[PDB]
Design a protein around this nucleic acid. Sequence first.
RNA 1: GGCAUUGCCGCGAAGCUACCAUCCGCUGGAUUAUGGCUGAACGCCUCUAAGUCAGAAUCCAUGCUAGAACGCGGUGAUGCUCCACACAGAUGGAUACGAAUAAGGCGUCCUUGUGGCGUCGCUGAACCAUAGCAGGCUAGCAACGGUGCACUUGGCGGAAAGGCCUUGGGUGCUUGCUGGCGAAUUGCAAUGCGUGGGGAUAAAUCAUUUGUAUACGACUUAGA
RNA 2: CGUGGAGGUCAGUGACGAAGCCUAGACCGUAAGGUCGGGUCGAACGGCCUCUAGUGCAGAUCUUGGUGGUAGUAGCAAGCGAAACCACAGCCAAGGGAACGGGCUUGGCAGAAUCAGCUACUGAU
RNA 3: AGAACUGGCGAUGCGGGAUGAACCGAACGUAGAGUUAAGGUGCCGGAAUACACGCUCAUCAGA
RNA 4: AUGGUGAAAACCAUCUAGUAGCUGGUUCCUGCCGAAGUUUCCCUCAGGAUAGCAG
Lengths: 197, 333
Amino acid sequence: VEPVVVIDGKGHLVGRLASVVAKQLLNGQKIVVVRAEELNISGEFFRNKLKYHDFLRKATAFNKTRGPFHFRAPSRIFYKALRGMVSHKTARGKAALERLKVFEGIPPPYDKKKRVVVPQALRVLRLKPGRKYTTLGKLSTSVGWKYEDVVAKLEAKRKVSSAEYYAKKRAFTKKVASANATAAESDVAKQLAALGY
Amino acid sequence: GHLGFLPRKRAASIRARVKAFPKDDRSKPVALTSFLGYKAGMTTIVRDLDRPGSKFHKREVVEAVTVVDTPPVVVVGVVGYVETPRGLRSLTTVWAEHLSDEVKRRFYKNWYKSKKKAFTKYSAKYAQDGAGIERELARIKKYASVVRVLVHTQIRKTPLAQKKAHLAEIQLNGGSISEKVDWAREHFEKTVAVDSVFEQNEMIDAIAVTKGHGQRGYHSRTSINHKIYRVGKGDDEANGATSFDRTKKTITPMGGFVHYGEIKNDFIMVKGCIPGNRKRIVTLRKSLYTNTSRKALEEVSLKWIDTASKFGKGRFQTPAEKHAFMGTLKKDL
RNA sequence: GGCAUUGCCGCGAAGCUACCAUCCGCUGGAUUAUGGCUGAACGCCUCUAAGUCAGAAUCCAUGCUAGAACGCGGUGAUGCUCCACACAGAUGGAUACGAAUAAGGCGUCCUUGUGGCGUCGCUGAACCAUAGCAGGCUAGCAACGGUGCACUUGGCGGAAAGGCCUUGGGUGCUUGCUGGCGAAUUGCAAUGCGUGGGGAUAAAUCAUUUGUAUACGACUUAGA
RNA sequence: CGUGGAGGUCAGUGACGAAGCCUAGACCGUAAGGUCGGGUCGAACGGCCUCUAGUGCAGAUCUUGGUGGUAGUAGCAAGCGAAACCACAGCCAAGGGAACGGGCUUGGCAGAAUCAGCUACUGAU
RNA sequence: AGAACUGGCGAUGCGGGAUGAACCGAACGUAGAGUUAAGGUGCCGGAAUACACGCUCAUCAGA
RNA sequence: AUGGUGAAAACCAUCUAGUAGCUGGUUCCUGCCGAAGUUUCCCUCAGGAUAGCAG
């Protein structure tokens, strides 16, 4: 139903998203999560900041350099939340994760290509109105990730370059809507409508 | 000892690289951020100290300083660096077409056998009204937040027989990136002076690789806050002459420095002691910020410069002082 | 001075090397404890529930050290030629606004607005493509469009641009409409770009030399 | 079901290759094992009805013989050259009731190969 | 702590309880098909990101 | 213990395969049946004398 299924984190929930992205892999379904940074969790911020640092104090004894490597970059922050549900050892896994690609923001060559959303993992469709809820972004920032800015800016730029596009397009489909609107009514038409079209 | 300087291991090169650079002031026009030279000797300075509220206010103070030999450094290229989620990234470097024999020598480990085919087809790529060169300059003119300049040492002017030009990178803190690349456009192949980066009475910082002994030594160290006392000029005679002393002499001691020759070019006289030893390359940066204390405020009045023979001992300054005291000898007449 | 398990003594550069000496040893956010501001719950009050201001040698960056030996980029240098051989899951289409969700699209009027009027959502169950030997060979009509392909004009894309648009001309196709032929026997299912040597020219290593480096390597050098 | 020998029998098989030995070969029997092809071999051997026994092995710090890892190591006061020892391997965290964690469960992770210090660790290719 | 009573393990695999002497289900020839127990159905994990009524914000909730 | 050999307390050869209130090991397949964990005195400690369960 589509070789690749670029998703857009923007307004999702680490866990649910993940999960569903998981299944999709183990069942041969390439994926590519974007805008990672603008992901979402549940519960105040000070929360996720703890339920993490703890994950930070981790580290191995004798050699801290060989223990739980604490990735800051969101993309990763989330990639973990995922590799956590995927045997990520037995070849069946490796085979998966090998089917993923979590980017922070939306770099080419996807920018130019449609995306989607997992309706079963939206802050706005799971979280009871007005209720604390992180935003990875900050969360990452607060714990290392040194780029929230770059993407940020280097983002707005993307939205431009596009927004501009749309216009051209929207301004295009404005014609069609007419072309048919007019070329409508005629005969050949009527008929179709009958059958449904 | 100090846990921070770990791993206490050997540096990658003799020319250490500057990890950071000063921030930015966009309101200013284009200016360089750092400058390179060679450490050469340790001279004695006495001067009246115009430091307010001191135990040594308006009194004469002795202190040992170092003279870094700094030739006029010449640009041979310019680089653009984009801002990424993964840090910085060099998207394009571009070069100055007519490079010296010295920079061409840097690109080979064996210069003697080499057919000297350095920037041949790249110079042939230039050979038109631009088209490819001006395209890559436009590439940096569009993207790339930070713009760095490729420069090298005029080693022939230096009395050292090393004959191999050190390439370094120096960014620009003069805002609007269009002006950065247009400054670099005007300044391809051009020799940049020493006094056109630093002045006297400025706090600076030097980077160097520290005097190896046996593992102990040969690390890259950065010491900060050092006052430039004198920015000298080789073409100007009487560099050792102050406003007070005014005796026509070079800052160079009698028969050159200890393990270093004469100073036939520009120099910087830095307070205290720079890391590394003589014959070593250093790179002087400009403090990263406005370091406003009263240690920075005072404009110094250099009273006298010691130019006695450090090789052994010295009771004289010029060779003129030797025969003035000794009179005349056997081999003379 | 030939010699003295390094003969004694006077002093000494080079080195071994030391609080036994000299120099150097940083600024932005975000907080705790607390002090507040706005202000409910609870027609008063209240630093708090929804917000917000300040603030610990804290925290996290800046700076500093190392650079993933399977992390990455840009740039310089010619790989070229002569013979002999070898050959983790495509199956119509990833079908580009952003933001909000106690709100939003789309269309219209303009009084250019947090403006008015109209209209949509309740799933992509859509949209666009879709007929021909796995897709042929030939005849028109009507359109002046659609579409493929090799070229050309101009423009844009640096985040991983490595692509997307356009102008002109040429050449196919057109199922938009009407035709004219071929399909069997496949027998009632079994999907139907490296080697092994030459030549020519770029470079690296070894050997030599140097020492700022050194357990050995490595590293810095120099030499048509 | 199998082994050594005995009586009987198959006018059994057999230098046109018996017995044995192998074999990424085939068949039969739930199995003990039996049968066959191929290769190697060179002189005896097997089925059937019975008899008889010094009859079937993974162990005994088993006995005898042979051969490894250790190891080109310790060593001899470039060459020569052991032995002790050896079920099997040797990353951490947490749980695994029982002064039992080394194999399991759930996680962190993990690139070939190797030398040197007190298998980690410093460092070096 | 002691006494008596009936089971479980002992001589006993199998499904489940993350993992297990004492829990839960179930006493085993070799298979094919169907239906279940105990336990479960976000994903690792086969199975409803099922339906319906309410409740819960925790500065290391809770299961 | 018997008999012998050596010597500023011994060894050799037989009796002797000595005696064990024990330690370790015990060699093919399949089928079928299948426990006991204990009653009472001999006193028990040791070995049994019996009843119970399986034929």
